[PDB]
Design a protein around this ligand. Sequence first.
Ligand SMILES: CCCCCCCCCCCCO[C@@H]1O[C@H](CO)[C@@H](O[C@H]2O[C@H](CO)[C@@H](O)[C@H](O)[C@H]2O)[C@H](O)[C@H]1O
Ligand code: SF4
Ligand code: SF4
Ligand code: SF3
Ligand code: SF3
Ligand code: F3S
Ligand code: F3S
Ligand SMILES: [Cl-]
Ligand SMILES: [Cl-]
Ligand SMILES: [Cl-]
Ligand SMILES: [Cl-]
Ligand SMILES: [Mg+2]
Ligand SMILES: [Mg+2]
Lengths: 263, 263, 581, 581
Amino acid sequence: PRIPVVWIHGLECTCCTESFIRSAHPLAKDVILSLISLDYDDTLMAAAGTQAEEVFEDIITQYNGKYILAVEGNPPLGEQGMFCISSGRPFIEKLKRAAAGASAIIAWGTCASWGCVQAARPNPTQATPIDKVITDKPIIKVPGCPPIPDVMSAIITYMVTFDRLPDVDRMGRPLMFYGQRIHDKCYRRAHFDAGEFVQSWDDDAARKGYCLYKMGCKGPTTYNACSSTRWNDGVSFPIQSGHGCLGCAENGFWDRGSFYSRV
Amino acid sequence: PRIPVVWIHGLECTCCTESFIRSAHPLAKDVILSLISLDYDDTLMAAAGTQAEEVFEDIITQYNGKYILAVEGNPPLGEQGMFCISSGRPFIEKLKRAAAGASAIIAWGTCASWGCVQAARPNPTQATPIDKVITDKPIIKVPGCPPIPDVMSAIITYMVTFDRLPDVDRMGRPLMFYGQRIHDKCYRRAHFDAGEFVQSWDDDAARKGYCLYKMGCKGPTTYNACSSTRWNDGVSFPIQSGHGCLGCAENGFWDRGSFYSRV
Amino acid sequence: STQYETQGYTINNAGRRLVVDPITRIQGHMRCEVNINDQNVITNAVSCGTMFRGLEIILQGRDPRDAWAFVERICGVCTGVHALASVYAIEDAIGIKVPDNANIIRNIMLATLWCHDHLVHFYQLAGMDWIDVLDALKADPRKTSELAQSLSSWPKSSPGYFFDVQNRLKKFVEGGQLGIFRNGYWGHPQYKLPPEANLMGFAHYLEALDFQREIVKIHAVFGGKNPHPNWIVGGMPCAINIDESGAVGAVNMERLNLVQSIITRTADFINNVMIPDALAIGQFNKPWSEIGTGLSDKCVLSYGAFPDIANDFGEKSLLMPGGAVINGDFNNVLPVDLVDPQQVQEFVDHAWYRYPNDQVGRHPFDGITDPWYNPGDVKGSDTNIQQLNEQERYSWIKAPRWRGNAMEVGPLARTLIAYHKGDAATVESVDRMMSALNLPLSGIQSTLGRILCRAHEAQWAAGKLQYFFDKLMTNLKNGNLATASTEKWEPATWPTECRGVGFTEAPRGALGHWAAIRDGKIDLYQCVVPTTWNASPRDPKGQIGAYEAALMNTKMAIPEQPLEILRTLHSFDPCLACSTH
Amino acid sequence: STQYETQGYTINNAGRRLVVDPITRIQGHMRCEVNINDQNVITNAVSCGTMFRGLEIILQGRDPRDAWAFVERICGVCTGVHALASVYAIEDAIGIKVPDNANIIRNIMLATLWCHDHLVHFYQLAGMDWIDVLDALKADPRKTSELAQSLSSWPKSSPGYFFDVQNRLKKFVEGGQLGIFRNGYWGHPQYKLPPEANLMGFAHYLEALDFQREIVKIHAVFGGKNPHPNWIVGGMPCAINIDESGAVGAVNMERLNLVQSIITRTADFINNVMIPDALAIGQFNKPWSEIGTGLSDKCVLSYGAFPDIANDFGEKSLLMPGGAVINGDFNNVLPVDLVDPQQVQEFVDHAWYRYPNDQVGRHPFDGITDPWYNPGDVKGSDTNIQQLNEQERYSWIKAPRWRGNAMEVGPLARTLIAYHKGDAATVESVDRMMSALNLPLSGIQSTLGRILCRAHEAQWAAGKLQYFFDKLMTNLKNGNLATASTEKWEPATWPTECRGVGFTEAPRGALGHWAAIRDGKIDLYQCVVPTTWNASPRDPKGQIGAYEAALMNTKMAIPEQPLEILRTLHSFDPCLACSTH
Ligand SMILES: CCCCCCCCCCCCO[C@@H]1O[C@H](CO)[C@@H](O[C@H]2O[C@H](CO)[C@@H](O)[C@H](O)[C@H]2O)[C@H](O)[C@H]1O
Ligand code: SF4
Ligand code: SF4
Ligand code: SF3
Ligand code: SF3
Ligand code: F3S
Ligand code: F3S
Ligand SMILES: [Cl-]
Ligand SMILES: [Cl-]
Ligand SMILES: [Cl-]
Ligand SMILES: [Cl-]
Ligand SMILES: [Mg+2]
Ligand SMILES: [Mg+2]
């Protein structure tokens, strides 16, 4: 038997599910067919409505204490929770029921970890990260908007293979991928050290791959794996394609000033 | 019709041919079938012996002045050239005949560009790079032992697409891929800057990806694209996998001291 | 219960009420309710968006140059399209013209998204409405091979391959851990494919799940990452260097070679896997050419997209045509103006928002996003909706109208607009397709037609990828490398007060962003998104939107198993995060 | 002319002389000459290595820790194997024991190379000797599909696929630019495949050319790059970090996931493309089970490889067995000792080198590499050779012997040794292969058998990749992460004088490096490489090596077209840069 997994969605854009399906190794196909039992997932499952409600209830009952809960998105506390409605009731009710039976929770993305765009000023819905609502369960934060595909799949394979949760930092992020800053492993650091900066888009510096610090790069304050693991089967990352890091793996990055203002 | 290409081999290990067939984009299959006419190549061609000599003669005669000559390896001047024998005669005779009809010459690899391992002290065969024998043709040097697969194919596509030779530095190397040093685009530069070095293999610093300068890395003196483009469809490069750069794209790198002595 | 007439429909909420909440195999959160009569035919349909985040509110006070990054996060499925509409809007407000290569690259980004999004929709979202996955276990692998080889030149067709797929599925199911297939609608009488077609389709589902990850490598080259690539106001940040020192730090020939390789593979997959599968769905499900017409024979809308002349958004530039048809009059395709206050307006009389006067519609430059959760009597409580009250406010989605008309947007709308404007390629394609199915042209105005049009748009976009790539390469060969205009990057160069509109055709239909800038900051930012149109609630005249109309008059075989509802809703590719933003 | 008898052959150099120079579809530079009688039968064969670089000379005075990097450049085809033999030799000399994970990774590197090298050889080097590429133009695509599907579960088999491949070939030759196919041996009577099998084989040639690039990604993860990955004395430089800060700078779970993905794909391709093709060549070319036997029924040699117990090179550790057979006595597999001066010796009486006494052999610890180009009384001249003089010195390849016996090495040799030692997997594999062909076991001792054994070994190595990967993961789960031993890294820790042997089984056969260290520097470094054995010239007793023996007694259909010579030579996978170093 494969380990049961329940994947639920609060307020979210679905970037985290989309990132997951981009995994190159293992393919998401192979994760679903061979590594886990993805037993509930609104984006992909056949059942709808009452049939989907039956799946949810059956799984969390049969596998009480034994399933992993993956959470994408977050609960809004405004309007009695009815900014996010599932089966006619506040999403937070579904979150709390799913959490109660879980052995552990994976908070995918900056939404579930910290709040992400809906929690940016002035947070109209009172969107709230998972760990401020669920306070009696192990929560692994895997931040990023979205996290890197092959990071998501590596964390999953670690847990399956090694039968344990990843070691985490003081914020609940896996040390393996979040222990160092973007700027600690950035291939443009030679230029940063030399004072060789892009000053305006498409200037001569930009065409030579100079450092993006003066264009607002938030790599110096951001912990993630983008500058080493890279994105989309190692093809690129934001800085390699010419835009500074936005800071998207960090709590509150939307409200830390303009993306084009220097750290 | 596709542009005729004659690819000859002197003293060599065939690492440059092997690198070429690793190309991810375009695939070497598509280069051969659709981009160029690979009209002579000892490694891949059906004909042998007198039939291969007939191909060589026919191509360089029918397409005199119109073919590109690719050279892998180099000619030995020792023993009247008979350290490398082709059709019972010194290889250098074949090189000179091929060169005389070529519009331009691509010197693949450190062997053809500079000399590589057979030219390292004491150079028993008096192995000599192409540009010291052929003095009346354009020669593009594409160094490395071997050069990066996707660099080789990008240079080919550039030439076919744009119908011109790449612009070169003072040493004949294409500026596009050889204009900057490994160490100018190395993702471990943050560690170099901070004085954070591997001191012995598999120490705690090595397990965190610290800089390899004190382990002998020659990235500071080496021009190539390995730290940006990387190797084998962007999977890795020497430093990323934990070994310092050997300096393999630079003239005389074998004789610049131990690989484990600091630059 | 009450009944009234609108748009040729009799809206009757007598009879049994059915609820489908959650709708799955969509993006985001939706609830649907219907009433069925004694013949199990839908006589009332209610579309409800069950989420809201408030991006229009969050964007206030931001620097316009940052806006794209925020609004990109409206949706990770249609990722990039909102960034594109944002940079368009801000450039329109300030008066910025981008260089040709930036426009070409943006067009590549959009075409890449069309290919990716349409492919994943067809297989991962809509496919299990048409393919009975469990019935694939009954297939003969040799007959499956024969079927596949009769439909396509695609290489992967051996009997051994189909046996291996079937065996993997058997072993997946055998331990009772059915995962995403648990408690599905398998065996419903509306599943009409033979077992061999189900196994072929399931094999292709898995191939598409693997292959889709490759398409977005184009976004990674030009935009850094997918989902959610990066953009700039003034062009793109992916500086180009082909033949100078430091090309290792830029988009160089190796990077462009990677892009070309992906384009070729993408076109091959779409043309030889998705296109024959879509035509086969049509061949085996012809009655669905008469189901789910909705507003597609009445009122359809496109803004147009893919400007081929940089900075020119007019009819001679847009490669994907714009226009509107109303009152079923396809002989008169009307021009669309997104500044005209009498054209696009949004109503909230049936939505959870406050206007000063909810009986009037507001153009987006006059838009207001003041959330007000107020469901009235829902036969439960405010935190327990048992039955939405469609006589009152019932959705987080605003109700857009065009000159007061309820419109359908998306692939079928676009196809009808292009066809009736006389686009020769569209006319030829559509006519050839309907001839091959032995159906009349009207058969396209249906649930089945939506699926067919989506597949043909994926083919169109894959072709346009090559066209745009070749355009970029032509410029590079001519020494034209520019990717950004920075003359008006600095806020001191901007008008003190200005406004602009950015528009395009997202995978799901007509998208617009309306932006007003004052004193260097966003003063107003209003979005009207394709699913906002299609999933719209009612207006003050009681007019119904595209989803509600397409569900009307539909027969259900088994009321408790809402496969017909799912088929029609999925044919629009609902994106609920987009619809509500 | 002269005639003499050796090893059951009558070596007769009367009659017509044929020369093949250059030999193509090999690595490096080779010349072959033969004499043929009136009956078109070879009565004399002469193997000549026509290149030399002098790595053994270049290594003198270097730091032992650097040696691997120099000797890896002996060969870019068998890239990595010389680095492995080198670190083994230096570790043996100094007394270094590597950690288990380093050993496992080295075994993965070697198995990866076996898979890659054997696949490319089968298709790109040897394939065109068996597949008539131009005859593929006459195939029926449907019959090609039916053939492929009868032989394999491989998915890529549709009639449309084979038609597309055939049409690509048709287009390729339509302009008269036949490229690598120009002036080939197409239509020779020894091409025996039907057109459909030629088209199947050609399709697979192209699939293999594409796929081989993926295999070596394993080398890129652990070794940085391929060709020519990196290594260290003491283990490997690819430090592991799975669960600690900074894993982004090391071999982490994502890197190991990439390796696993490649292993699976590699096994799938070998098992479902190469193995059925090898068997198909067998089925259609059974007479070649009786041609090219050479020394394979007389004397065969393996050193053994793939130590499963780290730092233990004995019989209980090596997964690929070692041993020697002489005198055709396969009942007596003899143990090999690479330190014993009476076992491995090299002769130069027929090679271009100086020894103090050229009538005796020198063990590699007493080896001398003093090049001396002296072809003597050739037809032609010393810079314009028309005929080598095989009664005098005729090659840059030294002549290795084992206890004075001339031996064959490589896949067939290893298979015979393992079979006759009773290795259960080898016996089962060989028996099932020969039963499928309805051939006796003796049919493996032939040119066809070399090809079959090479394919068997690719399958064996692909399986061992998974075994080694799982062993690595088991260690990581147990918290055993070490990849390097550094207590004897520094030269001051080494013995003042020491010597060592490093040995393995390269794709082409038994490889040894013999190293002597004195005062921190290489004092002697002698290599004996598999093609040195097989392509060997004669010795003082006139004994012939494996290539010369395999060519003896071969019938040629057309003397001017050396297809039978090429078939047999290519069956050994000659690597002439390796042979001469
Ligand atoms: C989409 C996919 C989402 C990811 C799928 C992942 C598969 C996961 C396998 C995880 C295996 C580890 O599982 C984890 O084990 C630890 C013990 O090690 C448990 O830990 C629990 O018991 C231990 C005692 O053992 C206590 O100290 C701890 O406080 C408690 O939470 C977690 O409740 C459980 O979740
Ligand atoms: S581009 Fe950003 S992360 Fe990289 S060196 Fe510059 S500031 Fe640091
Ligand atoms: S590892 Fe080498 S190239 Fe990289 S920063 Fe250190 S010295 Fe420079
Ligand atoms: Fe990733 S669902 Fe997309 S918004 Fe930022 S993580 Fe959330
Ligand atoms: Fe590349 S053939 Fe291999 S040795 Fe260094 S380049 Fe030469
Ligand atoms: S914006 Fe996000 S994706 Fe990586 S480079 Fe910065 S953490
Ligand atoms: S050794 Fe060579 S391969 Fe690149 S990293 Fe250094 S130039
Ligand atoms: Cl959910
Ligand atoms: Cl946040
Ligand atoms: Cl040559
Ligand atoms: Cl050199
Ligand atoms: Mg809006
Ligand atoms: Mg030797």
